[PDB]
Amino acid sequence: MNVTKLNDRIEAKKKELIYLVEKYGFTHHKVISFSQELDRLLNLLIELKTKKKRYSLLEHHHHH
């Protein structure tokens, strides 16, 4: 419901992903899938901002 929280969860996932690259490698299935997930939230930033005319800009997760 909040974009800076969203940004934060992306930030944390980036860091988590980096840690996993060190232990598993970037060619590892989980690291690939988490990268897709990280991409998904990164996409959310663009997606909600490209709309902005929607309550969804706030209620992207959790609805009012």
Provide the residue ranges of all domains of the chain, joining segments of one domain with +.
1-64
CB-based contact 21:31 (threshold 8 Å)? yes
SS3 40: helix
Max Cα separation, the chain? 42
Distance CA 22, CA 59 (A): 35
Architecture in CATH of 1-64: Irregular (4.10)
Q: How was this structure determined?
A: NMR
CA pair distance 60, 47, nearest whole angstrom: 10
Quote the CA–CA distance of 50 and 28 in Å, as a whole number: 32
- What letter represents residue 11's amino acid? E
Angstrom distance (rounded) from CA 49 to CA 23: 35
